[model samples]
Target: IEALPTHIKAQVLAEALPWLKQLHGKVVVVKYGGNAMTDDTLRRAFAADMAFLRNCGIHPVVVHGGGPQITAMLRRLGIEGDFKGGFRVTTPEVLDVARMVLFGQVGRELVNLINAHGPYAVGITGEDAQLFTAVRRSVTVDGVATDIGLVGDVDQVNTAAMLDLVAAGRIPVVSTLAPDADGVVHNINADTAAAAVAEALGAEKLLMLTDIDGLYTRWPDRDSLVSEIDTGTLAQLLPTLELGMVPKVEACLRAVIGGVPSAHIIDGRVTHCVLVELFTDAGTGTKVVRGE
Candidate 1:
């Protein structure tokens, strides 16, 4: 590594200058989860990326959910997890497990990893400081609204607390669990939560990390990967997308339509992928922009 040519290194750094200048003091909301959260190497890389962004004057906010972790905990506790219409059917008991894993386990680990670089990470939840207010959510299956108990859709995002942390140069690592109007806490989807937060903060970009490279015009076809798409085109393609990618694509659509300039779904498996997407001439992944 040390044998690399000096001029080449300098050129790479020079290439980032324009991006750095443009993004200085701008907000970027990142949705982290999937394999990136479970893999040890990827986790450290993600933490380092966050720290790097902060140091470069780009504010980053992380929103996460622990689906596999919660499922593992549920298995250990003898609770059978259920999913209907791609939404977790969270009973009271399951909700308890979600809260523990999402905040107590997953959020804390992310915070600790980022803090390892410095004391620059703070773990928070949608419930903290009333950051997120939501309404009970129901999924329509066969045209019938089916109740998935204790699940929520973000109705509002109170950006005060998040802005305070960002102003003080602390990265906010958020867990997706919000309360309804009656003070009943509900499990919120991480992708949905991230979009709501990005729009609320008027972020420059919403970057959602996932296992896949990006959206594909044809699923599982590498050649069909979409480099960039617009809100209207994405909206038209939404229903046709595969189940696993639907929520992520929907989140991107919502973010762009809600006034965030652009939203990206990128592969978190790649080290420094955030930097690559933000600073490089050829960004990696599918970018969703507002259409004319």
Candidate 2:
């Protein structure tokens, strides 16, 4: 280690430090979820990173999914959410709580945290400024009819409001709750919400914080982790994942295709993961671009 050239050190910091200043005023749309949300330590680390991003001149837009909270709430209310693919079955009642928790209580708490940690933050749902309009999600799971009332697929994500808020140096924490034209509430996919917002804002980067350390070419073994992937390879890999990660991959591809320079999927459980991924040469997650 002592034989390492000093230039290597300079180069390492160059990738991370120079980008920090460069990222200032740039929109870094982030999808925050997974284990980090439920864990208190990870939650603070996530919040601290948001403050750091703002101080570095990056406008971070946070979009989250409340799977754990909603689950706990349903149990308390005697509502067992229906599910087939690990996704909550948002019946009319459950979807109602999804909307309330995601957009109301949770959203407010996150906004307060961001503001307290750094600059003032304003939180909104996909329907706040009508940031997103959605279509009712339909699913036929294993030959069973699933009426995920108020669950939605994002039809449009309006980033005009997002841009204005960030440009003013105020952080925005967005709730992934959208409304259909019929006024029915829908649970939007958090990954899709972040990507759509990034694309609409023409963000330079979309950094998603997840539970794991990026994409691995092979599952159950992370030694096959690919540091960098292009659209073509990522597209091929998207449908192959056995778990829920397929939708996340789709979201990354969408952002890269939508004029964003790059998209990252990194582990948020670890502290300083942002700096590790952005600055160091041996990055900790998948950094996808349009081409290899």
Candidate 3:
């Protein structure tokens, strides 16, 4: 508190005043994953950021994926995993493991982290209250049709539970594990799931925390960081994006078009990236917005 000069401290707080006012009582849906989920320091920082947002009156809803954990567990259990079109092929056995990891471990851990700050978190998955209703998703690539059994695309998000929790001053830590009409469990893509929830909730922003810094004019090139982009320009540039960024890029588009004012692809590896992105003029990543 005593380190910075008087004017500098005043300037920092002054800068944040506008952001605080804009975000207060607003809804932000976060697609949580990447290094932030696994790294200790980043994880703790993220937990603190959640509590801060809640206290600031900015409601935050989390949607997460457990790909690395699921893969490790599958390997330990001697079950082989498959993927098609970059999406995991979830089998019956895979679904079981997914549930165990997502809810039993990943979801619970996040809830606990947030609660460590205060009793402010509720861990829930798509299976609960039909939170995420889905349909079987099949994609073809290279002239081959892949069933990729049990994977589903989220068709709907029953927001009652989410709204109820938020209204009651609790953050909902949602796992991106959905169920189909026949009661079959499916592993939904976290980014896509977050978009669905954001649309359903009419969120102001969808912040997708990922490994990369954000969209780049040329990825792996630090100088190419794109500060802001609108949907129309992004559409023309999509084909040129690096392979790893395609999914999140599309996820950003889906969110903004679905009514979220903007979508951010941020570097989750950075400590307090959420705060930097939302509370500062020097935002931490690329922002996607709708264009006329």
Candidate 4:
């Protein structure tokens, strides 16, 4: 980039000017996961993007998942993890493992990565200030209701502390672990938690980072990538999506239906994908918008 012609750099800035204006002072809730979290280069790029957004006057809040980390930790501890219907069967012991990995390992790693740019990132959990209220979740498999112990569905999000951090020019890096009314903490799905937070914050946009390129009309078909979709159409297509994709698309649907103007699912393998999505006309990934 430093070797690029001076005029080319100026042109890039000119191109971003309009987007900057549109996003200035607006909140964008990003669900960070997949390769971006585990891979060193992608992780750094993601952190840089967050810092860049903050510098540009956009309030960027991150909600992250630690599936791989948790599983790895569980294996080291000789705790065999299980999954049913694409949801982790989070027993009480597994819940403890999840809390440890998510809050201690994954969240801290991201916070440190972002703080490398400056004193800009603060790690917090859904437990902080009772940020998220959730209920136990169950899944249906083979026409039978199955319990995925300690897994939760976010019922509400309290954005007070989150908003305070944003107003103070600090980025909040959140881990998904919420308490039910009885004070029992449960493992909340990061995608679902992110959408709830976005709706609660009345965020301008919700961006979910995943392993895939984007939502596809036909799975595994590169040409079937959907650049843009509407809520009604997405809802109709939801049932046809694969299990791994169900929660993400549902999160986008919920975010849009909850009054957010737009939501996106993008490939985390691409460096600086967030910037490309936000600042360019030909954005990357699938964008979900409210329909008439």
Model 3 weakest lDDT span, ten residues long: 216-225
Positional deviation of residue 100's Cα in model 3 after best superposition, in angstroms: 0.6
User: Can you list the residue pairs that collide in candidate 1?
Assistant: none
Model 2 per-residue lDDT tens digits across residues 1-292: 6887999877766667667765767888888888777778777677777888788778788888887888888888889766666666667888788877887777777777777775657887766768778887777766776765567777776677668888898888878877888766678888987898888888888888887665766766756567888999877776666375777788889889879899888878777677677666366678889994
Give candidate 4 regions above 4 Å deviation.
1-3, 82-88, 142-146, 219-225
Model 4: lDDT equals 0.87
Tell me the TM-score of each prediction against the true structure. 0.94, 0.87, 0.94, 0.92
TM-score of 2: 0.87
Quote the positional error of residue 92 for candidate 4 in Å: 1.4
lDDT of all predictions = 0.87, 0.78, 0.85, 0.87
lDDT of 4 at 258: 88
- Clash totals in order: 0, 6, 0, 0
Instruction: Write the candidate numbers in order of decreasing TM-score.
Output: 1, 3, 4, 2
TM match of model 1 to true structure: 0.94
- Model 2 lowest lDDT segment of ten: 216-225
Tens digits of per-residue lDDT for model 3 on 1-292? 6888999978877889887887788888988899998999998889999999999998999888898899999999999767767766777888999899988999888998889989888988778887777888877866877787887888877776668778899899988877888888788888888888988988888989989866767656766657788988998888988888799999889889878898988889889999888877475778898994
lDDT of 4 by residue, 1-292 (tens): 4899999988887999887887899999999999998789999999999999999999999999898888899999999767776666888999999999999999999999999998899988767888778888867977888887998888877777678889999999988898988889998889988999999998999999988766766766666657888999888888787767889999999999989989988888899989988887464778899995
lDDT: the better of candidates 3 and 4: 4
